[PDB]
Amino acid sequence: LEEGRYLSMDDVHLLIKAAEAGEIQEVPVRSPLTCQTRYGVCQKCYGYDLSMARPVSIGEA
Amino acid sequence: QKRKLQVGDKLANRHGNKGVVAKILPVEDMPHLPDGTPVDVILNPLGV
Amino acid sequence: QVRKEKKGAGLEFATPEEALAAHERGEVALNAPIKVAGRETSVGRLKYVFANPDEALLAVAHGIVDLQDVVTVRYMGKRLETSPGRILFARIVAEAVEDEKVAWELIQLDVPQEKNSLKDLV
Amino acid sequence: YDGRTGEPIEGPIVVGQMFIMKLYHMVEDKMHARSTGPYSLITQQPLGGKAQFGGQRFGEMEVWALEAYGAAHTLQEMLTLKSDDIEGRNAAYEAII
Amino acid sequence: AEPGIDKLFGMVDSKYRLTVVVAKRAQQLLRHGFKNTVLEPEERPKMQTLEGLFDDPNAVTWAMKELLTGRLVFGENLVPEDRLQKEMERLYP
Amino acid sequence: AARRMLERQRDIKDEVWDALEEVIHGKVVLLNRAPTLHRLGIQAFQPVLVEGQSIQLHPLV
Amino acid sequence: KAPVFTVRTQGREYGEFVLEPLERGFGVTLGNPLRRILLSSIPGTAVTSVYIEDVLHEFSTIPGVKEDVVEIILNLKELVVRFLNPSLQTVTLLLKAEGPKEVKARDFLPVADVEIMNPDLHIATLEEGGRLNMEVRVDRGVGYVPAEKHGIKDRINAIPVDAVFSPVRRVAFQVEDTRLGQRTDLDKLTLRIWTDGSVTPLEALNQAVEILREHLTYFSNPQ
Amino acid sequence: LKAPVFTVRTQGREYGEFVLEPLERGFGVTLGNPLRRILLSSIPGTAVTSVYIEDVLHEFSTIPGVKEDVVEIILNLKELVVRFLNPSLQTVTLLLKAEGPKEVKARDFLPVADVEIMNPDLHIATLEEGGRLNMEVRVDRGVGYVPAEKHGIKDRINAIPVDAVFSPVRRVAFQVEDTRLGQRTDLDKLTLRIWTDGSVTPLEALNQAVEILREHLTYFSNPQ
Numbered sequence: 001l002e003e004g005r006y007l008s009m010d011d012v013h014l015l016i017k018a019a020e021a022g023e024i025q026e027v028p029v030r031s032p033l034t035c036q037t038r039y040g041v042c043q044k045c046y047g048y049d050l051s052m053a054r055p056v057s058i059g060e061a
Numbered sequence: 062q063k064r065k066l067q068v069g070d071k072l073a074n075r076h077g078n079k080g081v082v083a084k085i086l087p088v089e090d091m092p093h094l095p096d097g098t099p100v101d102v103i104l105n106p107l108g109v
Numbered sequence: 110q111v112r113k114e115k116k117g118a119g120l121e122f123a124t125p126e127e128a129l130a131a132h133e134r135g136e137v138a139l140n141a142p143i144k145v146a147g148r149e150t151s152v153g154r155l156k157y158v159f160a161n162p163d164e165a166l167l168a169v170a171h172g173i174v175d176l177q178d179v180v181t182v183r184y185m186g187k188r189l190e191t192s193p194g195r196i197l198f199a200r201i202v203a204e205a206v207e208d209e210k211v212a213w214e215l216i217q218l219d220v221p222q223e224k225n226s227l228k229d230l231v
Numbered sequence: 232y233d234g235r236t237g238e239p240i241e242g243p244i245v246v247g248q249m250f251i252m253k254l255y256h257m258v259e260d261k262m263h264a265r266s267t268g269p270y271s272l273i274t275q276q277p278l279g280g281k282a283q284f285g286g287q288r289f290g291e292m293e294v295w296a297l298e299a300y301g302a303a304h305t306l307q308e309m310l311t312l313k314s315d316d317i318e319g320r321n322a323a324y325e326a327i328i
Numbered sequence: 329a330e331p332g333i334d335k336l337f338g339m340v341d342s343k344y345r346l347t348v349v350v351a352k353r354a355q356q357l358l359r360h361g362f363k364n365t366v367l368e369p370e371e372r373p374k375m376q377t378l379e380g381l382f383d384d385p386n387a388v389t390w391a392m393k394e395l396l397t398g399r400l401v402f403g404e405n406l407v408p409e410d411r412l413q414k415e416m417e418r419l420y421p
Numbered sequence: 422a423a424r425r426m427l428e429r430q431r432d433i434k435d436e437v438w439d440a441l442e443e444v445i446h447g448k449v450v451l452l453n454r455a456p457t458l459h460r461l462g463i464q465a466f467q468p469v470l471v472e473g474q475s476i477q478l479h480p481l482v
Numbered sequence: 483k484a485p486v487f488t489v490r491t492q493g494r495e496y497g498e499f500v501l502e503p504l505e506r507g508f509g510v511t512l513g514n515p516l517r518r519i520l521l522s523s524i525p526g527t528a529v530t531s532v533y534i535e536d537v538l539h540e541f542s543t544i545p546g547v548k549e550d551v552v553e554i555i556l557n558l559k560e561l562v563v564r565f566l567n568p569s570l571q572t573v574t575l576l577l578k579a580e581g582p583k584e585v586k587a588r589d590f591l592p593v594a595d596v597e598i599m600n601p602d603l604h605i606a607t608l609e610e611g612g613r614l615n616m617e618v619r620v621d622r623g624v625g626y627v628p629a630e631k632h633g634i635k636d637r638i639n640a641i642p643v644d645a646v647f648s649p650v651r652r653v654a655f656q657v658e659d660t661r662l663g664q665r666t667d668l669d670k671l672t673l674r675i676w677t678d679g680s681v682t683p684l685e686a687l688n689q690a691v692e693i694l695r696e697h698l699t700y701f702s703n704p705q
Numbered sequence: 706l707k708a709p710v711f712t713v714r715t716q717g718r719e720y721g722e723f724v725l726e727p728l729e730r731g732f733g734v735t736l737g738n739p740l741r742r743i744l745l746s747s748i749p750g751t752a753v754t755s756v757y758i759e760d761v762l763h764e765f766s767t768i769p770g771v772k773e774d775v776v777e778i779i780l781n782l783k784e785l786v787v788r789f790l791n792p793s794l795q796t797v798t799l800l801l802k803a804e805g806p807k808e809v810k811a812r813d814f815l816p817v818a819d820v821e822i823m824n825p826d827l828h829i830a831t832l833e834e835g836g837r838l839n840m841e842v843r844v845d846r847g848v849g850y851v852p853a854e855k856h857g858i859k860d861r862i863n864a865i866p867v868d869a870v871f872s873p874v875r876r877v878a879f880q881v882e883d884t885r886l887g888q889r890t891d892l893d894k895l896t897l898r899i900w901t902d903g904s905v906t907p908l909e910a911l912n913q914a915v916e917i918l919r920e921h922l923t924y925f926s927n928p929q
């Protein structure tokens with residue numbers, strides 16, 4: 001699972017399943033709470049979610 | 062003037078089942094009893 | 110959804126060769142119904158054999174079998190034993206969308222549809 | 232029986248004579264269809280009352296949602312061309328006609 | 329839904345990009361006369377009782393259909409600002 | 422001219438109607454519930470001539 | 483052997499017909515198709531508009547008159563008439579009695595051709611010196627028509643009404659088993675119809691069946 | 706008013722788009738349901754009656770040198786479509802025998818009189834080295850769908866009655882939507898879509914239908 005990849009629903013499952021085996025408890029991911037962008041945020045820091053399912057379109061309210 | 066029930070009309074029962082009036086299908090293609098006499102009003106069971 | 114009639118008797122076909130016939134004969138009488146607790150399949154899924162999905166409907170809407178009755182029909186390339194109601198749902202979704210392949214590739218024709226079943230489907 | 236196709240509906244249908252009734256709330260007190268009409272003698276709002284009617288309010292709530300969508304123009308359109316700035320209003324009427 | 333809306337979103341780097349692009353070309357289609365199209369030959373939008381939707385149906389309805397084909401090109405700074413309505417009004421009546 | 426044509430007519434010309442529909446064509450309007458809390462509190466739809474005095478709305482929305 | 487079209491007519495109202503034998507459940511492909519039209523295409527008769535002397539609006543009442551406007555007006559559409567020529571597209575009757583008496587539809591002034599199959603219809607009653615005066619407009623259209631859709635103005639202060647044509651009370655079709663033929667998987671369609679009086683079952687029958695035929699031709703010129 | 710315009714859009718010889726409108730209130734249905742009833746239950750055509758093979762005994766067995774099961778074959782049969790020339794063919798027997806490695810298509814059958822197999826490239830079965838395969842299927846003319854257990858045609862007592870797949874019409878799906886017309890909008894937009902195996906194009910298909918229908922109405926003459 002390369003860096004920056006936008007984990008989809010499916011991905012999440014493999015995460016849960018893996019965790020069940022006691023392989024991982026944490027998950028390194030970008031989030032608005034660490035965005036450097038002065039006002040507003042970045043696509044990456046934000047994420048997938050949108051009226052769609054793919055990456056959020058730049059400039060979304 | 063007269064108030065002849067049309068489309069935006071709403072009516073309920075003494076039991077508290079309120080609901081608007083969608084389409085008003087003509088007696089023609091209206092579910093009928095094996096012996097003529099078609100139905101009058103069609104309520105949806107899901108509201109029971 | 111499919112319907113589960115009453116088993117006239119432990120219809121054993123997992124071994125009785127004649128069962129395909131005999132156990133089904135009793136069916137011809139008043140013994141085991143159409144959708145009995147079939148061993149590997151109720152008589153229903155055996156008397157009526159359907160090649161192309163279309164074949165199903167025909168007999169269905171003709172008054173022969175219902176939509177919740179277990180029968181047999183071949184699809185993409187396998188003889189699956191299900192019911193009209195199930196098979197239909199297939200042609201439906203596969204129609205609403207061009208690619209029929211992926212269509213039946215992402216559904217569960219072996220479980221009565223319900224909220225979630227659809228939710229995920231969408 | 233269906234009546235539409237004549238094919239009766241498989242499965243009896245409980246029937247009887249239920250007692251219903253219409254309520255005070257009719258469709259008369261609701262049927263606002265406006266496009267071009269009067270204006271607020273004080274501010275500048277499309278209020279009717281006489282020959283025409285008055286367009287429902289928009290409220291900040293609806294706007295927000297509108298803001299969410301990102302309909303910058305659709306929104307700006309509602310806050311101006313369809314209200315205050317009377318210039319763009321008529322200017323618009325001309326372009327349309 | 330709308331015609332190949334998906335194919336559109338895939339051509340743009342941002343959802344909102346599409347909008348601004350569809351709108352800009354939509355206007356240029358009516359203001360600068362309705363003969364700036366690029367798919368006028370065949371498969372051109374049609375009406376009903378009278379397929380007269382071959383001349384003036386709806387702006388955007390055409391705009392998108394134009395993008396349907398990789399005939400046009402877009403970008404941030406493609407052609408000079410002012411040199412826009414100058415090369416357009418002179419090329420089209 | 423057209424303004425007076427229908428300034429008041431209990432016999433709205435048959436031509437008028439056909440024209441109206443010919444006006445909208447692609448253009449789409451907007452629908453809004455009274456209590457708007459979410460974005461979808463307003464969605465776009467392609468109107469079409471209908472009977473009755475009430476607005477016909479799709480069940481899915 | 484060919485499907486025998488029998489008839490068991492019993493008066494002007496009731497009308498039963500039998501059609502057998504019939505193919506694999508065909509009686510149904512006929513019973514409903516026809517039945518439908520039978521109650522939404524058959525042209526009848528009804529009261530279009532009326533004008534009372536001592537009246538301005540339908541929501542009024544006349545002295546010496548028991549039942550109020552709306553009450554009588556309703557008892558009117560309940561009336562049924564019969565024309566005797568394709569020309570009687572528009573006929574208007576008139577009646578006006580006084581003193582204590584039951585206002586029966588029959589009391590009307592006969593108009594040669596057109597006949598009223600609804601004699602006993604109790605329209606209204608007059609106490610003493612009841613100023614009964616009206617103008618009953620009658621037409622022969624089709625189906626139902628809103629009183630506010632046509633707007634009949636026989637007179638300046640006359641109020642229209644609603645269409646009550648379709649001389650069909652109720653229809654039903656029975657797709658019983660077979661009676662003849664070496665095959666038991668046959669049908670015997672039999673429909674029983676009821677008419678207000680205008681046109682007899684037969685009448686109504688032929689008509690519908692014809693409307694059908696004609697429609698079948700529209701499927702000519704392809705595309 | 707305006708007489709309904711009957712348009713069409715036939716793609717090949719299986720699909721059939723038909724559009725007939727506008728139509729009065731609730732009439733497209735008064736036309737859709739009836740049609741459909743005959744469009745798939747009265748249409749004449751061809752179908753596989755009963756099949757028979759020497760080495761075969763039960764419908765649930767397996768012939769050596771042949772991967773497809775008894776049912777798989779019989780099923781590949783009902784599918785196959787034929788065509789007769791003159792009405793003097795209420796019954797026609799088709800035979801077929803082949804051995805050794807090779808694909809068994811429907812065109813392998815022995816050419817008979819005024820009969821044609823418009824469905825040649827049909828994969829009926831493939832035999833391997835020493836694949837002893839021979840059979841004699843019977844086919845006649847009927848209507849609609851009739852279960853194998855229904856008619857029960859038994860030439861050889863050990864033969865097997867097969868289901869009826871006459872009416873080359875695969876299926877139909879009418880539609881009665883409301884269209885516009887200036888003054889009124891609660892109109893009718895009846896649209897019938899017909900499918901066929903190829904024996905007959907959707908065009909003809911419907912024709913015979915209406916034709917038969919009309920004729921049936923003619924029986925509304927002589928009273929009693």
Ligand SMILES: [Zn+2]
Nearest residue numbers: 035041042045
């Ligand atoms: Zn950021």
